[PDB]
Amino acid sequence: MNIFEMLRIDEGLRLKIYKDTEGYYTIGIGHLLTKSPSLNAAKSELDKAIGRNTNGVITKDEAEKLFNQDVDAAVRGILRNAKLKPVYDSLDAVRRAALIAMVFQMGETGVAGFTNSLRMLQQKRWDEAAVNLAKSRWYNQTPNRAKRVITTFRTGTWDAYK
Ligand SMILES: [Cl-]
Ligand SMILES: [Cl-]
């Protein structure tokens, strides 16, 4: 199991523009296009991301390309984030993947604000961080997915994804 498979499980794969859990225009494997309510705005963003007139649809390969880019960006985001970097560096390989998944889902900025959880994670206080992570809008809105990420931090194994 790895970060790619993990997120592929959590996000799914859709080849046609769609609205995410927040009602935002997305496509592929969790690739947010725009927060604008305009389907045209999204179609435009889409065409610009892919480099062609897509008409709201893309191929599996294009979806995968966006996904790789997105994963790469999340890692780079973490590495360049002063609050995130140190946490990441302190963790083992399974847990690093869980932090990447959180950043992928909610952005570098969103994660950087879980100050208390981040500190618990750095201190290797697993159960406590797990409890703290659950007191969030994130968990309340997408509980099944959040539980999977949280169990990953708690246990340091991929059991939740198996
Ligand atoms: Cl892009
Ligand atoms: Cl969910």
Contact by Cβ (8 Å): 131, 106: no
Residue 49 and residue 33 in contact, taking contact as beta carbons nearer than 8 Å: yes
CA separation for the pair 30, 11 (Å, rounded): 5
Active site residue 11: yes
- Boundaries of domain holding 94: 1-162
Q: Which of 20, 47, 64, 128 is catalytic?
A: 20
Q: In this structure, what is the dihedral angle of CA atoms 154, 157, 161, 162, given to the nearest 10 degrees?
A: -130
The ligand placed nearest to the CA atom of residue 28 is 1
Could you tell me the distance, in angstroms and rounded to a whole number, from the CA of residue 133 to the centre of ligand 1?
Answer: 29
User: What are the residue ranges of helices labelled H in 2-136?
Assistant: 3-11, 39-50, 60-80, 85-90, 93-112, 115-122, 126-134
Rounded CA gap, 2 and 20, in Å? 23
* CATH label of the domain that carries residue 93: 1.10.530.40
Residues, the chain: 162
The residue type found at 37 is: P
Give resolution, Å, one decimal. Answer: 1.9
CA of 140 to the centre of ligand 2 (A): 9
- 6 alpha carbon – ligand 2 mean position (Å): 14
> Would you say 114 is a known binding-site residue?
no
Q: Residues 77, 112: contact at Cβ < 8 Å?
A: no
Structure method: X-ray
Q: Which residues pair with 19 in a beta bridge?
A: 25
How far, in Å, CA of 131 to CA of 154, rounded?
9
The answer to whether residue 47 is catalytic is: no
Name the nearest CA neighbour of 102 among 118, 82, 122, 116. 118
Distance 11 CA to ligand 2 centre (A): 10
- The number of domains in the chain is 1
